[PDB]
Design a protein around this nucleic acid. Structure first.
Ligand SMILES: Nc1ncnc2c1ncn2[C@@H]1O[C@H](COP(=O)(O)OP(=O)(O)OP(O)(O)=S)[C@@H](O)[C@H]1O
Ligand SMILES: Nc1ncnc2c1ncn2[C@@H]1O[C@H](COP(=O)(O)OP(=O)(O)OP(O)(O)=S)[C@@H](O)[C@H]1O
Ligand SMILES: Nc1ncnc2c1ncn2[C@@H]1O[C@H](COP(=O)(O)OP(=O)(O)OP(O)(O)=S)[C@@H](O)[C@H]1O
Ligand SMILES: Nc1ncnc2c1ncn2[C@@H]1O[C@H](COP(=O)(O)OP(=O)(O)O)[C@@H](O)[C@H]1O
Ligand SMILES: [Mg+2]
Ligand SMILES: [Mg+2]
Ligand SMILES: [Mg+2]
Lengths: 239, 346, 330, 319, 328, 285
DNA sequence: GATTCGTATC
């Protein structure tokens, strides 16, 4: 607002020539509220000033971030009381972000941040049920549309005043993938040790089920009454 | 070596838990030339692989147990390097295509069509068997290559694939194979096997009841029961008493604790804690199908739930198992099952 | 020597049984030369690969066959690029000349056949590519598509290809062929068997032949020199005994959840197949006169849902327990 | 076999005065033509509403006799990679050409929505380095496909859908210049089937004239087909299931419409569909998605579509 | 050697007068040819309705002899990526015409198989070289075509063939092949065709092959059903009557007996019963919803394969249960 | 054998098949066979056609023992030949024998090194641009080396598009130039009027009968198509140009009976004719 | 988009 005012007070003659100086303040406020881009704001102001008609003031649309989209899906959007139009514009403008598995994972991870998890379990069951159903459509646009619409409707029917929401976080799936990769490496090492030391071929499923716990236990008992792999595969489990 | 491998029956006459299945295997192995393609299906740990190896020993003689392991390289559409381990002995081959994921089709094509066309003349021609462990894990694309591979090249190769719950095996594959059912041993036979093991191992046993307890706790799993036996043998200084605790895997204990928590506290925060526990389970590469199965059958063992709650739990478990079969991310369906259970319990 | 399925595969169109419609059309095409593009579809083990191989042999003979036939199946890559290059190049190819012996002994029609077996495994892109390749070269090349599920074949290709549905081989359809095979392999069967084999093997002669071979191997290993009984056939076909099924039915009748759960646990320890026991339960419940129409409607839908869920590679234990619990509350 | 240009290209406007529709935008473009200080601009909107013609008319009215070597029109049909952008655009912008006092070179980038991102970054460098000598005019269908760093430098002009009055006026001009016989209801039908598209209206009018001569409702509707999105909306909003089924059958199945097309149009209609509750709308979206999956897997019969309609009526009728 | 071809690509029309069914499209394209102006056409419709035949006949009529060097035809069998559109199509529609003069034709058969990049490139080729070249876009699915590409094309819709067109083509083929056809066989063929002429020609070829002496014997509906392997209408009516009226055991027995009499499939019975029930006047409206939903689920499961007896009993149970609301 | 032809100068077949290399490297090549000789005709995009002819006197043996049809037509993939005939010559007679046994028979190419006979059989596949000789806008006869240098320079420059100038004069100041449009823009490559390079240049006014002076002929050609003739000009001695009114450029290359090459090209529609005025003004300047 | 904390201004 301050800098657009400076540009106007440096173009008073022309601005005063076209009698647009009695209106410049409202358009400056509108431009400042619409964009956070100084160059685009000044370009739009120049287009409005040099024009001689009733052309609408149009500025470039800024993209919506990941957590911004998550918050818009969860808590809704201010100035847009229509869920349908908000979700529609979200899909048209940010289809690259919304058409991903990471967005559904983010919704699943962050839907508990509404009122610090202090809402009915029926709503949570409905949300996760809809997400699971959407997971059975293999990236069709209808899946994402239905999932986001259902999440928004569920959180709208329970939203009231006096809510103190939490802070969203990125899904921890990559952590689980890294842990699974470490498990795969350890299981490969155990299988490699489990052939040349003693002739035996064990399937990976058995390694994950029984040999990841019982074989390290045996080797630890053997360690105490005395083989390379003595600790549990994947580390110990907790809770 | 483990007691599961130390006392593995190396001959068709050394199998002493099913008898009738042994008679059928001997009938098959009397004339190996007309041997069809076999499909061994039965509960996990009953001994299907031992039966396959015993049949192979009956056909090709001793030496099928001299396994050589080599790494063979593959290339996918995106030209990435994949390394499948092929446990190869003379007279037969072992392949686990599930070592690769959806990329097992290229293995079933390259590696198997290589040996199917390649004859085994050395003026005399023999057929070399190929063992496919975990036939269920094939992705309906490996099986489609498999069917024509074994139909057209039957003269040179024979397929013996082992699996449990052969429902995810397509109809063309099932129609092309001889279906061999391998039932799990009863508690008496498991106890007898454990008695032979402890006798050959010089473990001091207080009473024979503590072997029936192992057999009952393993739920008809020979390998699991033998691993429990070795565990309490090496955790009790080779002297087992009735006070010796029945030991169960860590993930089973975690699932039982999760069941207790789900029955006790039913809120969204409890749901988040259950999600954390499920993520920890998945971090240990425990497949989500068996996670859901164990969760369901631990929730059906709680005595505080009436018949309506148990029926709702089993219905939701079936629905979400079908969802998990067709899904891509397991956490959605696991969380949905837990949320439905927590919503129906109250 | 060989498994009886590959040993008794038909060599000419006369050996193919119970599919008279397609086989007469193809036999009449033998004396003509206007063979269309054919779409062979039907249940597994119904005689489609046998029919196409027998026709191709009767057409070209052992010699011309190697030069006038291209076979693509699911064991080889059949992507969009492969369809656009290799299939189009083979269709473009001029018709190789027959020899004197081929010209006199075999009909040798003036065209080549491209057989695309397991065509239901091809993506819709490859089939769209195949559309005009099939069309614009219809005078020099003929296309045969074989599949079990027609719906996996896109509508254009289904329109271009002439459709030949292969019927399921019931007891009536394949009883003569099974008798032929049994007699030529010296199989002593009790009366009633060779019909139980075809009833268990619903619409599948490969399964029936393998069942007969396994029963013969058992009866030969016994050395007892007695006939094969239906009980043995049901035993090694995976059929649950009637007493176990009766126990299942009686535990369902007394609708106690814990009793059913324990029984299902032991039964699934016994290693049975959930699809087979579900089928047997269907037969028992739908054919029983002790139940009313409403119960039968509900049980039919429950069995349909359970079969559909089992066809998706789900957990047999959970599906069977849920089905039996639902039946207990009907 | 002969020589006669189609009316779409025979009647393409050559001056900004002949372009109908967005009066304010066209007036602003005329002002730019007269003063000559053209800024970087982005033109976006629906297809066939006078975006390319506006750009080319502005270029002609701004460059005059220097249009021959003053514009560099690059389009989707031409290669527009990073190397092409760099070399050609840089050499064109570095070309020192003396122009009238208030004039600049113009670089028309039609179909800029189909340009690789790295080429857009190179365009950023060229735009911010040679801006004093040349100006850029982007023609696109949606401004989202132009990266934000490029939209920062441009004055965004959005072309709205053509109103029925403007398309009627242009149709009347073309009619009174080609001497076709017409009826008021015929032009109304052409307007209705055009659906805010001038190119489609011209094509339909020419097709009707060629096929039958007089342009009335009967000829137009016997040669052109009513927009199937409207039929889909009519069938989705039907009160009872029998009427919806009958509409589907007799208006989309007998007419020869693909089931996948019907399903996709149903989804698009449901996205923009008022007078329905959010829960009902998302339930309809879910059922349409399930039916779309069944169609994609090969089960694309009329039974699947009838079942989808039945499920929609269950959810929206409390049945 | 036109006697060495399948009936489908033996009776392909060579002239526009031989394309039946699409009276309006043919009349309008003939007028376009006569007036000398041809726009950018877009032919859309179901498979086997006369799109490729129409466009090839039209191109032959426009360029009787120069067809080889006047028409560029591309289809799904040829690669049509961004490079192909940029090079081959542009260079064809950028050079002067052969012989005296004319306009070049570029036919894009099965253009719904083209990527969006190729269509986006093609749109400016269409708009820029239209003075001497016209495009024809053939497509079964219009949702795979970019909205701009649809905008710059003149849309002609090919309806499924009516009864009269198929009857006329059948008469032509019968005269050509010296075949006979009973009126009931004609009706059966009309119903099985479902607006497709390739299906009619294939079925007729199989019917001629079925006959022992195709020079004396006719073709009745019995031959039609035997060769095509479809349930007779009487069988469908009997199965539906047994399901609706009789009890469960006899309904199941009747279904199995009817199926085993001629080896009928369950999906054919399902489609026949659905066609019969669509004429039924239901009085509860929930009877229709249940029928449609249950039968669609059964049809989908059948498409994925599985137990045939279970699916058949499911069909019987679904029908009897739904018709419970009718009396309510 | 229906057709048989043996030769010892395989350098002719090598250079000949390299003359089709500037065209599609992976496509099919159409081969006519007749008593006068066999010809390798190739076509690209319906807009350019090369036609290279090996006469009967080229081969020491040429039989054509067939009478049912005047000519034999067979189409084979070009790079099957290119891959197969990569024999690296030998030094051994290396005699090459071409055979064809009618329809349904492969095209055979036998190579004998007096011990080794590497016989290769090529599978045959399923099977226009001619200028109307009565109407020729202009006709020019140039030396091969000058034209080769011109195309080499035009390729050095890139030359997105090219132009041809032909304007004879009253004082016989015949001018023939290759105008390009490239990164540099308009570059004029004019060939000299000397009889050493340009031996004849007649520009007609239609019907190819009247030698009219003071008027110019402009040919707008796509340079990707104009480059296909470059490798043929390398072995050429005299290159003959013949452009008609229908926008067809025919190049008559003969490496003196040697080999004869017929390259026919379709000329661009020239959307805007302002460039034509620009080119002629650049010329007269 | 929400929360928390900190500024700056009126
Ligand atoms: N009609 C038949 N007459 C004779 N043998 C048959 C017939 N149908 C099937 N068979 C036998 O079934 C076995 C395999 O049948 P195939 O026709 O080769 O397989 P299929 O019909 O293609 O089934 P797929 O490939 O799984 S869909 C062979 O042993 C055949 O002899
Ligand atoms: N406002 C208009 N006034 C007059 N003719 C118009 C108008 N809009 C479109 N046309 C006609 O449409 C044709 C050219 O339309 P274009 O402006 O090229 O379409 P477009 O707006 O560029 O849409 P796209 O994105 O390029 S498909 C010519 O035949 C014009 O006569
Ligand atoms: N209107 C018609 N009149 C006569 N025969 C027709 C007609 N429409 C189709 N046919 C027949 O159908 C055969 C193939 O139909 P085509 O029209 O060539 O294919 P199509 O219409 O392009 O359908 P798609 O989209 O390519 S699957 C032709 O060879 C004719 O025998
Ligand atoms: N008849 C038997 N007697 C003794 N041990 C047995 C017998 N059958 C199986 N086992 C033991 O069971 C263990 C695991 O069985 P395994 O073959 O791995 O089952 P699966 O084939 O289901 O994986 C083996 O280590 C083997 O020693
Ligand atoms: Mg087969
Ligand atoms: Mg445009
Ligand atoms: Mg077509």
């Amino acid at each position: 607002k301050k800098h657009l005012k400076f540009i106007c007070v440096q173009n008073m003659k022309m601005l005063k020539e076209k009698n647009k100086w009695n209106k410049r303040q409202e358009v400056i406020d509108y431009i400042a509220q619409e964009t956070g881009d100084i160059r685009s704001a000044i370009t739009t102001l120049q287009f409005w000033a040099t024009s001689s008609g009733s052309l609408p003031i149009s500025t470039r649309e800024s993209t919506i971030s990941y957590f911004h989209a998550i918050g818009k899906v969860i808590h809704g959007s201010h100035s847009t009381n229509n869920d349908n139009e908000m979700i529609n514009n979200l899909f048209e403008n940010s289809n690259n972000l919304l058409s991903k598995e990471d967005f559904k994972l983010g919704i699943l991870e962050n839907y508990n941040t509404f009122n610090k998890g202090e809402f009915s379990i029926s709503d949570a069951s409905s949300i996760v049920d809809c997400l699971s159903e959407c997971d059975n459509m293999n990236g069709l646009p209808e899946s994402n549309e239905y999932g986001l619409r259902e999440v928004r409707k569920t959180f709208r029917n329970i939203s009231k005043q006096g809510h103190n929401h939490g802070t969203v976080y990125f899904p921890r799936e990559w952590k689980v993938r890294k842990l699974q990769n470490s498990f795969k490496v350890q299981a490969e090492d155990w299988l490699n040790v489990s052939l040349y030391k003693y002739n035996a071929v064990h399937s990976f499923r058995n390694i994950t089920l029984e040999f990841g716990y019982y074989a390290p236990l045996i080797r630890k008992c053997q360690s105490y009454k005395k083989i390379d792999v003595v600790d549990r595969i994947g580390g110990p489990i907790e809770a | 070596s483990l007691w599961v491998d130390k006392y593995r029956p190396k001959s068709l006459n050394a199998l002493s838990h099913n008898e009738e299945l042994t008679n059928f295997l001997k009938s098959l192995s009397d004339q190996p030339r007309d041997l069809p393609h076999l499909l061994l299906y039965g509960p996990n740990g009953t001994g299907k692989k031992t039966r396959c190896m015993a049949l192979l020993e009956s056909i090709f003689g001793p030496g099928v147990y001299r396994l050589k392991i080599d790494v063979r390289q593959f290339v996918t559409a995106s030209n990435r390097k994949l390394e499948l381990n092929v446990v190869s002995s003379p007279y037969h081959l072992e392949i686990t295509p599930s070592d690769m994921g959806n990329n097992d089709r290229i293995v079933i094509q390259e590696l198997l069509k290589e040996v199917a066309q390649m004859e085994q003349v050395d003026l005399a021609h023999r057929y070399k068997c190929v063992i496919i462990n975990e036939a269920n894990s094939l992705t309906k694309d490996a099986q489609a290559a498999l069917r024509r591979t074994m139909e057209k090249y039957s003269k040179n190769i024979r397929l013996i694939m082992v699996c449990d719950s052969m429902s995810p095996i397509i109809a063309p594959i099932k129609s092309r194979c001889l279906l061999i059912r391998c039932p799990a041993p009863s508690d008496s036979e498991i106890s007898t096997i454990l008695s032979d093991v402890v006798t050959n191992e010089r473990i001091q046993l207080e009473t024979k009841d503590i072997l029936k307890r192992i057999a009952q706790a393993s739920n008809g799993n020979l390998r699991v029961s033998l691993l429990m036996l070795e565990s309490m043998a090496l955790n009790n200084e080779l002297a087992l008493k009735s006070s010796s605790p029945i030991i169960k895997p860590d993930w089973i204990i975690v699932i039982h604790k999760l069941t207790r928590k789900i029955v006790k506290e039913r809120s969204v925060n409890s749901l988040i804690e259950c999600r954390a526990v499920l993520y920890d389970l998945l971090a240990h590469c425990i497949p989500a199908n068996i996670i859901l199965k164990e969760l369901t059958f631990s929730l059906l063992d709680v005595e505080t739930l009436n018949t309506t709650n148990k029926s709702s739990i089993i219905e939701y478990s079936s629905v979400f198992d079908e969802r998990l079969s067709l899904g891509n991310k397991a956490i959605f369906h696991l969380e949905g099952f837990i949320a439905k259970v927590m919503c129906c319990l109250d | 020597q060989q498994p009886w399925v590959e040993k008794y595969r038909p060599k000419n169109l006369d050996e193919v049984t119970a599919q008279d419609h397609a086989v007469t059309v193809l036999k009449k095409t033998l004396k003509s030369a206007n063979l269309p593009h054919m779409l062979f579809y039907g249940p597994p083990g119904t005689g489609k690969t046998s029919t196409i191989l027998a026709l191709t042999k009767e057409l070209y003979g052992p010699d011309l066959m190697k030069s006038r036939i291209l076979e693509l199946n699911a064991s080889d890559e059949r992507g969009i690029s492969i369809v656009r290059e290799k299939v189009k190049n083979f269709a473009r190819l001029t018709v190789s000349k027959p020899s004197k012996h081929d010209l006199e002994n075999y009909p040798c029609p003036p065209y080549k056949i491209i057989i695309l077996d397991e065509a239901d495994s091809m993506t819709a892109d490859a089939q769209s590519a195949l559309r005009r390749t099939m069309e614009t070269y219809s005078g020099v090349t003929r296309f045969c598509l074989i599949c079990n599920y027609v719906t996996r074949i896109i509508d254009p290709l289904a329109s271009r290809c002439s459709k030949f549905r292969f019927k399921a081989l019931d007891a009536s359809n394949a009883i003569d062929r099974l008798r032929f095979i049994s007699e030529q392999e010296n199989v002593k069967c009790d009366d009633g068997v060779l019909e139980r084999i075809l009833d268990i093997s619903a619409g599948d002669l490969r399964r029936g032949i393998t069942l007969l071979q396994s029963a013969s191997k058992g009866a030969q290993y016994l050395g007892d020199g007695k006939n094969i009984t239906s009980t043995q056939v049901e035993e090694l076909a995976g059929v649950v005994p009637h007493d176990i099924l009766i126990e299942i039915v009686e535990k369902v009748k007394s609708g106690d959840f814990d009793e059913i759960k324990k029984y299902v646990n032991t039964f699934m320890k016994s290693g049975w197949s959930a699809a087979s026991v579900v089928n047997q339960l269907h037969e028992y419940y739908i054919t029983n006169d002790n139940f009313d129409t409403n119960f039968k409607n509900q049980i039919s839908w429950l069995l349909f849902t359970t079969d559909s869920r089992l066809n998706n590679g789900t957990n047999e234990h959970i599906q069977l327990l849920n089905l039996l619990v639902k039946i207990s509350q009907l | 076999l002969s020589l006669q240009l189609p009316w779409v290209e025979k009647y393409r406007p050559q001056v900004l005065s002949d372009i109908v529709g967005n009066k304010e935008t066209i007036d602003r473009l005329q002002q730019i033509a007269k003063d000559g200080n053209m800024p970087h601009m982005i033109i976006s909107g629906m297809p066939g509403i006078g975006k390319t013609t506006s750009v080319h008319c502005l270029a002609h009215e701004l460059l005059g006799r220097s249009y021959a070597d003053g514009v560099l029109e690059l389009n989707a049909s031409d290669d527009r990679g990073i190397d092409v952008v760099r070399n050609q655009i840089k050499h064109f912008a570095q070309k020192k050409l003396h122009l009238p006092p208030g004039k600049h070179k113009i670089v028309i980038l039609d179909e800029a929505d189909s340009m690789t991102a790295g080429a857009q970054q190179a365009l950023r460098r060229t735009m911010e380095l040679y801006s004093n000598s040349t100006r850029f005019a982007f023609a696109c269908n949606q401004s989202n496909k132009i990266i934000e760093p490029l939209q920062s430098r441009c004055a965004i002009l959005r072309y709205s859908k053509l109103s029925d009055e403007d398309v009627l006026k242009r149709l009347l001009q073309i009619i009174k210049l080609e001497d076709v016989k017409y009826t008021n209801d015929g032009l109304e039908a052409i307007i209705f089937t055009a659906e805010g598209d001038m190119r489609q209206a011209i094509n339909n009018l020419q097709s009707t004239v060629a096929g039958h001569g007089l342009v009335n409702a009967d000829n137009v509707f016997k040669i052109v087909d009513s927009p199937h999105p409207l039929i889909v909306k009519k069938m989705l909003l039907a009160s009872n299931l029998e009427d919806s089924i009958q509409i589907l059958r007799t208006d989309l199945w007998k007419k020869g419409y693909s089931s996948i097309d019907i399903v996709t149009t149903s989804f698009r209609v449901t996205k923009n569909l008022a007078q329905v509750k959010e829960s009902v709308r998302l339930e309809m979206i879910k059922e349409i998605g399930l039916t779309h999956m069944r169609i994609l897997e090969g089960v694309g019969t009329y039974l699947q579509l009838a079942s989808m309609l039945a499920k929609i009526h269950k959810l929206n009728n409390k049945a | 050697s036109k006697e060495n071809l399948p009936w489908v690509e033996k009776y392909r029309p060579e002239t526009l007068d031989e394309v039946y069914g699409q009276n309006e499209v043919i009349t309008t394209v003939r007028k376009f040819v006569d007036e000398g102006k041809l726009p950018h056409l877009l032919f859309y419709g179901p498979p086997g309705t006369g799109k490729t035949s129409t466009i090839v006949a039209l191109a032959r009529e426009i360029y009787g002899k120069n067809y080889s060097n006047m028409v560029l035809e591309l289809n799904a069998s040829d690669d049509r990526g961004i490079d192909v559109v940029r090079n081959q199509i542009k260079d064809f529609a950028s050079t002067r015409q052969i012989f005296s003069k004319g306009f070049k034709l570029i036919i894009l058969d099965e253009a719904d198989a083209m990527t969006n990049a190729a269509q986006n490139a093609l749109r400016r080729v269409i708009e820029r070289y239209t003075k001497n070249t016209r495009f024809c876009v053939l497509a079964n699915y219009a949702h795979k075509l970019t909205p701009a590409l649809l905008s710059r094309c003149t849309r002609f819709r090919f309806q499924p063939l009516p009864q009269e067109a198929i009857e006329r083509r059948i008469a032509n083929v019968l005269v050509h092949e010296k075949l006979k056809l009973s009126p009931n066989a004609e009706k059966a063929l009309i119903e099985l065709s479902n607006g497709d002429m390739r299906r009619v020609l294939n079925v007729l070829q199989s019917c001629k092959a079925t006959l022992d002496n195709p020079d004396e014997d006719e073709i009745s509906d019995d031959v039609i059903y035997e060769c095509c392997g479809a349930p007779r209408p009487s069988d469908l009516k009997a199965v539906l009557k047994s399901i609706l009226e009789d009890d469960w055991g006899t309904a199941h027995y009747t279904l199995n007996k009817v199926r085993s009499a001629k080896g009928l499939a369950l999906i054919d019975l399902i489609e026949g019963i659905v066609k019969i029930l669509e004429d039924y006047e239901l009085q509860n409206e929930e009877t229709r919803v249940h029928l449609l939903t249950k039968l669609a689920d059964i049809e989908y499961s059948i498409s994925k394969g599985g137990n045939d007896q279970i699916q058949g009993s499911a069909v019987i149970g679904a029908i009897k249960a739904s018709f419970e609301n009718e009396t309510v | 054998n229906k057709f048989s032809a043996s030769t010892v100068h395989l350098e002719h077949i090598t250079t000949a098949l390299s003359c089709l290399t500037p065209f599609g490297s992976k496509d099919d090549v159409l081969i006519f066979i007749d008593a006068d000789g066999l010809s390798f005709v190739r076509e690209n995009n319906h807009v350019i056609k090369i036609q290279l002819l090996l006469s009967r006197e080229l081969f020491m043996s040429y039989s054509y023992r067939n009478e049912t049809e005047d000519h034999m037509k067979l189409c084979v993939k070009i790079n099957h030949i290119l891959d197969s005939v990569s024999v690296m010559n030998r030094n051994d007679i290396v005699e090459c024998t071409l055979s064809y046994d009618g329809h349904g028979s492969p095209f055979v190419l036998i190579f004998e090194d007096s011990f080794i006979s590497e016989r290769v059989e090529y599978s045959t596949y399923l099977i226009g641009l001619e200028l109307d000789r009565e109407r020729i806008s202009f006709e020019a006869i140039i030396k091969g080396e000058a034209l080769h240098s011109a195309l080499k320079d035009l390729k050095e420059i890139g030359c997105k598009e090219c132009y041809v100038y032909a304007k004879t004069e009253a004082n016989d100041e015949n001018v023939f130039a290759l105008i390009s449009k490239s990164q540099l823009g308009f570059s004029k490559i004019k060939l000299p009027s000397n009889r050493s390079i340009l031996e004849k240049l007649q520009v007609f006014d239609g019907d190819s009968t009247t030698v009219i002076d003071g008027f110019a002929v402009i040919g707008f050609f796509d340079f990707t198509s104009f480059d296909k003739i470059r490798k043929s000009t390398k072995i050429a001695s005299k290159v003959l140009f013949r452009m008609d009114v229908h926008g067809v450029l025919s190049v008559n290359i003969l490496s003196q009976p040697g080999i004869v090459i017929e390259v026919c090209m379709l000329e661009k529609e020239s959307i805007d004719e302002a460039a034509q005025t620009e080119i002629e003004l650049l010329m007269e300047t």
